[PDB]
From Swiss-Prot:
Filamin repeats: 12-118
Function: Protein glucosyltransferase that catalyzes the transfer of glucose from UDP-glucose to a serine residue within the consensus sequence peptide C-X-N-T-X-G-S-F-X-C. Can also catalyze the transfer of xylose from UDP-xylose but less efficiently. Specifically targets extracellular EGF repeats of proteins such as NOTCH1, NOTCH3, FBN1, FBN2 and LTBP1. May regulate the transport of NOTCH1 and NOTCH3 to the plasma membrane and thereby the Notch signaling pathway.
Top-rank taxon: Eukaryota
Post-translational modification: N-glycosylated.
Full-protein interval shown: 20 to 130 of 502
Transmembrane segments: none
Record family assignment: Belongs to the KDELC family.
Compartment list: Endoplasmic reticulum lumen
UniProt-recorded name of the protein: Protein O-glucosyltransferase 2
């Protein structure tokens, strides 16, 4: 069997990933013990907040450690607010350093990946 789909649109602002800002308790020094979750705000080319509902599956998140490999991370994106989203993930293995990667249709949203290693001060 086989089928197809369709959908037209236009006029709306120009959703821009680069602009979109990614903030949360994840990109911090003292993160949560178990798992953390950050928010993803959709911004246009004019640096304006979409504060709207784009769709169900529009933004994705990748989780993988530079030292440890073969990490089956099942991240799920759910629309909590009428503009922002929540990113949750589960892991049953040692977590020393992870790499956050956010992309949109082949376009990086934030300054990813994100390398977070070394308790604050290191050089010293």
């Amino acid at each position: 069997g086989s089928s197809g789909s369709s959908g037209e649109t236009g006029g709306e602002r120009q959703l821009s990933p680069e602009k979109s800002e990614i903030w949360g308790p994840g990109l911090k020094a003292d993160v949560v013990l178990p798992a953390r979750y950050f928010y993803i705000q959709a911004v246009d080319t004019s640096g304006n907040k979409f504060t709207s509902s784009p769709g169900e599956k529009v933004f994705q998140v990748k989780v993988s450690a530079p030292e440890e490999q073969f990490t089956r991370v099942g991240v799920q994106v759910l629309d909590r607010k009428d503009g922002s989203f929540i990113v949750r993930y589960r892991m049953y293995a040692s977590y020393k350093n992870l790499k956050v990667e956010i992309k949109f249709q082949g376009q990086h949203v934030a300054k990813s990946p994100y390398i977070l290693k070394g308790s604050g001060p290191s050089s010293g």
